[PDB]
Amino acid sequence: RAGPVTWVMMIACVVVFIAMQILGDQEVMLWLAWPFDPTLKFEFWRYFTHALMHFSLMHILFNLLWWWYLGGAVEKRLGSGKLIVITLISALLSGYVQQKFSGPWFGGLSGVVYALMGYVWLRGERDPQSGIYLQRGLIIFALIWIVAGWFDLFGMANGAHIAGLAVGLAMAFVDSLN
Ligand SMILES: *C(=O)C[C@@H](NC(=O)Oc1ccccc1)c1ccccc1
Ligand SMILES: [Cl-]
Ligand SMILES: [Cl-]
Structure with a gap:
């Protein structure tokens, strides 16, 4: 389990x-979102807590499905x-890239998931002896989500997702060295 x-x-x-x-998206975003005024820059949880917010049912359901499977395997x-x-770094870097390109009003585990799938995939691709790997069906299921978000077929930005992926690839790379 x-x-x-x-x-x-x-x-x-x-x-x-x-x-x-219960409270509406905005009000919760008021407390947990990436610092959206310099007044807030020293509220340090915000560099992370943005990852905890989701805006629709499908958002949290698919994110948590991938998190449970990949994160749970890791x-x-x-x-x-x-x-x-992996979570701390991917959350920080994707959050960073996201706000840089489009401001502080965003949320969700997507950056973290991109990191986990980049991690599991590269790790197994380079070192089966680890025991972790992204099996073929999932590589396919995963790519379909990457494609979707990429061309904005679901409504959700690319740069932040790339940033998340970079973190996972980087850590798998490092982990698969001797
Ligand atoms: C974040 O990207 C929201 C997005 N989640 C998703 O794409 O997860 C995955 C799955 C596999 C590889 C990368 C990312 C999303 C979009 C639409 C509906 C729910 C979730
Ligand atoms: Cl398979
Ligand atoms: Cl390891």
């Missing part, structure tokens, strides 16, 4: 998403610390 990081992240995302139903085979670091 899904490890503690995999589990606690899912719960947090659910709780936050409930809060957004936690189980490579440990909780690994998953924590």
Whole structure:
């Protein structure tokens, strides 16, 4: 079963998403979003908490599905610390790129997922002995989501997703060295 990081992240995302139903998107964004005024630049959770917000049912459902599967695999085979670091860095870098290109009003686990699939894929592609790999059907399911978001077929930006992917590829690369 899904490890503690995999589990606690899912719960947090659910709780936050409930809060957004109860209070509206904007009001929750007022507290958790990337600093959107210099008044807020020292509220440090915000460099991370933006990842916890989702705006539709499908957003949180698909994000959490991929998180549960990939994140859960990473936690189980490579440990909780690994998953924590991939998450922290991908969240920060994709958040950074996103706000740079389009301002601070955004949310979600997408950057983190791009990192996890970049990680699992490259890791297995370069080092099967690790035990982790993105099997063919999932490489296909994954690419279809990459394509979708890329050409804006679902409504959700590219640069931030690339930024997330770069983090996962970078860490898989490093991890698969000796
Ligand atoms: C974030 O990108 C939202 C997006 N989630 C998604 O694309 O997840 C994946 C899956 C596989 C590889 C990369 C990213 C999304 C779009 C539309 C509906 C739900 C979620
Ligand atoms: Cl398969
Ligand atoms: Cl490792």
